Enzyme design. Structure first.
Site, PDB file in Angstrom:
ATOM      1  N   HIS A   1       0.793  -1.211   0.000  1.00 18.75           N
ATOM      2  CA  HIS A   1       0.000   0.000   0.000  1.00 18.75           C
ATOM      3  C   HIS A   1       0.836   1.276   0.000  1.00 18.75           C
ATOM      4  O   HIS A   1       0.238   2.306  -0.324  1.00 18.75           O
ATOM      5  CB  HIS A   1      -1.000   0.085   1.157  1.00 18.75           C
ATOM      6  CG  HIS A   1      -0.491  -0.406   2.458  1.00 18.75           C
ATOM      7  ND1 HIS A   1      -0.044   0.425   3.467  1.00 18.75           N
ATOM      8  CD2 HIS A   1      -0.438  -1.669   2.933  1.00 18.75           C
ATOM      9  CE1 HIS A   1       0.281  -0.320   4.519  1.00 18.75           C
ATOM     10  NE2 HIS A   1       0.075  -1.583   4.204  1.00 18.75           N
TER      11      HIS A   1
ATOM     12  N   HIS B   1       6.787   7.064   5.276  1.00 18.21           N
ATOM     13  CA  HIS B   1       6.214   6.648   4.014  1.00 18.21           C
ATOM     14  C   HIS B   1       5.477   7.856   3.411  1.00 18.21           C
ATOM     15  O   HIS B   1       5.328   8.909   4.062  1.00 18.21           O
ATOM     16  CB  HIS B   1       5.258   5.450   4.203  1.00 18.21           C
ATOM     17  CG  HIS B   1       4.085   5.769   5.082  1.00 18.21           C
ATOM     18  ND1 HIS B   1       4.132   5.646   6.458  1.00 18.21           N
ATOM     19  CD2 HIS B   1       2.895   6.393   4.788  1.00 18.21           C
ATOM     20  CE1 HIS B   1       2.986   6.104   6.949  1.00 18.21           C
ATOM     21  NE2 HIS B   1       2.221   6.582   5.960  1.00 18.21           N
TER      22      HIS B   1
ATOM     23  N   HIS C   1       2.052   9.131   0.685  1.00 18.54           N
ATOM     24  CA  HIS C   1       0.861   8.916  -0.135  1.00 18.54           C
ATOM     25  C   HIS C   1       0.898   9.855  -1.321  1.00 18.54           C
ATOM     26  O   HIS C   1       1.346  11.008  -1.190  1.00 18.54           O
ATOM     27  CB  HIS C   1      -0.440   9.235   0.693  1.00 18.54           C
ATOM     28  CG  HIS C   1      -0.442   8.524   2.009  1.00 18.54           C
ATOM     29  ND1 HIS C   1      -1.072   7.300   2.173  1.00 18.54           N
ATOM     30  CD2 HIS C   1       0.156   8.820   3.182  1.00 18.54           C
ATOM     31  CE1 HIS C   1      -0.914   6.908   3.462  1.00 18.54           C
ATOM     32  NE2 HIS C   1      -0.090   7.743   4.058  1.00 18.54           N
TER      33      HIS C   1
ATOM     34  N   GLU D   1      -3.360  13.402   1.760  1.00 19.40           N
ATOM     35  CA  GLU D   1      -4.459  12.902   2.649  1.00 19.40           C
ATOM     36  C   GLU D   1      -5.070  14.114   3.403  1.00 19.40           C
ATOM     37  O   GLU D   1      -6.275  14.397   3.240  1.00 19.40           O
ATOM     38  CB  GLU D   1      -3.876  11.882   3.650  1.00 19.40           C
ATOM     39  CG  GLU D   1      -3.427  10.641   2.867  1.00 19.40           C
ATOM     40  CD  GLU D   1      -3.397   9.393   3.671  1.00 19.40           C
ATOM     41  OE1 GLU D   1      -2.864   9.430   4.817  1.00 19.40           O
ATOM     42  OE2 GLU D   1      -3.959   8.397   3.192  1.00 19.40           O
TER      43      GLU D   1
ATOM     44  N   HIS E   1       4.613  11.067   5.771  1.00 21.93           N
ATOM     45  CA  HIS E   1       4.297  10.767   7.151  1.00 21.93           C
ATOM     46  C   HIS E   1       5.525  10.156   7.843  1.00 21.93           C
ATOM     47  O   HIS E   1       5.931   9.027   7.453  1.00 21.93           O
ATOM     48  CB  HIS E   1       3.146   9.724   7.190  1.00 21.93           C
ATOM     49  CG  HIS E   1       1.841  10.337   6.797  1.00 21.93           C
ATOM     50  ND1 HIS E   1       0.717   9.634   6.388  1.00 21.93           N
ATOM     51  CD2 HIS E   1       1.536  11.641   6.694  1.00 21.93           C
ATOM     52  CE1 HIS E   1      -0.260  10.475   6.072  1.00 21.93           C
ATOM     53  NE2 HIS E   1       0.207  11.706   6.237  1.00 21.93           N
TER      54      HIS E   1
ATOM     55  N   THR F   1      -4.220   6.507   9.140  1.00 19.91           N
ATOM     56  CA  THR F   1      -5.073   6.712   7.939  1.00 19.91           C
ATOM     57  C   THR F   1      -5.168   5.458   7.099  1.00 19.91           C
ATOM     58  O   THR F   1      -5.846   5.532   6.047  1.00 19.91           O
ATOM     59  CB  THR F   1      -4.500   7.876   7.082  1.00 19.91           C
ATOM     60  OG1 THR F   1      -3.295   7.436   6.412  1.00 19.91           O
ATOM     61  CG2 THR F   1      -4.267   9.116   7.810  1.00 19.91           C
TER      62      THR F   1
HETATM   63  O1  LIG Z   1       1.625   3.619  10.703  1.00 22.41           O
HETATM   64  C1  LIG Z   1       0.937   4.790  10.993  1.00 22.41           C
HETATM   65  C2  LIG Z   1       0.920   5.282  12.274  1.00 22.41           C
HETATM   66  C3  LIG Z   1       0.207   6.393  12.681  1.00 22.41           C
HETATM   67  C4  LIG Z   1      -0.551   7.079  11.661  1.00 22.41           C
HETATM   68  C5  LIG Z   1      -0.532   6.575  10.325  1.00 22.41           C
HETATM   69  O2  LIG Z   1      -1.295   7.205   9.374  1.00 22.41           O
HETATM   70  C6  LIG Z   1       0.185   5.420   9.978  1.00 22.41           C
HETATM   71 ZN   LIG Z   2       0.474   7.607   5.977  1.00 19.93          ZN
END
Ligand SMILES: Oc1cccc(O)c1
Ligand SMILES: [Zn+2]
Ligand SMILES: Oc1cccc(O)c1
Ligand SMILES: Oc1cccc(O)c1
Ligand SMILES: Oc1cccc(O)c1
Length: 257
Positions: free
Chosen positions: A61, A91, A93, A103, A116, A195
């Site tokens: 993902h 990571h 998005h 997001e 993030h 998320t």
């Molecule tokens: O692995 C995580 C931990 C905290 C928030 C998030 O979006 C993803």
């Molecule tokens: Zn994320």
């Protein structure tokens, strides 16, 4: 299993994860005019000088760059946070197109992507016990816009062709996450959730106001990754973002006047 398609995307996740419709889900739209400056916020401290990256993983993902979190090495403290939060992974998005991908949104504006940096509260010993707590996690979120290249992102872009499919990993030592930050640490903060499934409500979100710029070419390399495993039908890893969720009984606080 869950994903981002019509058949298994965000509007379906509530059937396996009922907290999808909970009281403090993320992401949210940040209305800049209604967010309130909070003089109770302490200075934010991002201390990433001793960070120890280990590996980069395509998990089907997104891709995660993972860190050694077995000691205090790369931590977040201050701002809304009580105590010390240790960096474990980051990571992104992103979109199929530059006009969407983030997001969080800012007055409904979607950025091309969002980073993030995930941290856990060291009072709880490790990440798995932290995700059982309402103040277990802190995520530093950083918007990406398309313009000039970000030099400190290029080592990430250049390893992606080695983790094209789900379950692939590569070594990724000696990566310095300070190269992904913008200049300013002005931010908005609110309480929210993961998320992605399991969507747990553990998170203090700290979303920086200043986006980083990455180039078109950098973001196009993210869009060559695959959601599927090797030897399954190819589905490009694009639009792996959950849309804004209802704010409910929350206020977004600003660090800046
Ligand atoms: O692995 C995580 C931990 C905290 C928030 C998030 O979006 C993803
Ligand atoms: Zn994320
Ligand atoms: O805070 C508000 C109030 C009314 C319209 C809008 O876009 C934002
Ligand atoms: O790849 C990872 C490593 C650690 C926590 C997590 O949510 C994901
Ligand atoms: O980078 C990681 C990934 C998984 C567990 C952990 O403690 C650290």
């Amino acid at each position: 299993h869950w994903g981002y398609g019509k058949h298994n995307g965000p509007e379906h996740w509530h059937k396996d994860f009922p907290i999808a419709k909970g009281e403090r889900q993320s992401p949210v739209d940040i209305d800049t005019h209604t967010a309130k400056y909070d003089p109770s916020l302490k200075p934010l401290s991002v201390s990433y000088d001793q960070a120890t990256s280990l590996r980069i993983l395509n998990n089907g993902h997104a891709f995660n760059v993972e860190f050694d979190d077995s000691q205090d090495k790369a931590v977040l403290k201050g701002g809304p946070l009580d105590g010390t939060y240790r960096l474990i992974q980051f990571h992104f998005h992103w979109g199929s197109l530059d006009g969407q991908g983030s997001e969080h949104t800012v007055d409904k504006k979607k950025y091309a992507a969002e980073l993030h940096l995930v941290h856990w509260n060291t009072k709880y010993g490790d990440f798995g016990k932290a995700v059982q707590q309402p103040d277990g996690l802190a995520v530093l979120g950083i918007f990406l816009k398309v313009g000039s290249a970000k030099p400190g992102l290029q080592k990430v872009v250049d390893v992606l062709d080695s983790i094209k499919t789900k379950g692939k990993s590569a070594d990724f030592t000696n990566f310095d996450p300070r190269g992904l930050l913008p200049e300013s640490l002005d931010y908005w903060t609110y309480p929210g959730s993961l998320t992605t499934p399991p969507l747990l409500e553990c998170v203090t979100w700290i979303v920086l106001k200043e986006p980083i710029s990455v180039s078109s070419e950098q973001v196009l390399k993210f869009r060559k990754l695959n959601f599927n495993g090797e030897g399954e039908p190819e589905e490009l890893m694009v639009d792996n973002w959950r849309p804004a969720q209802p704010l409910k009984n929350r206020q977004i606080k600003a660090s800046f006047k």
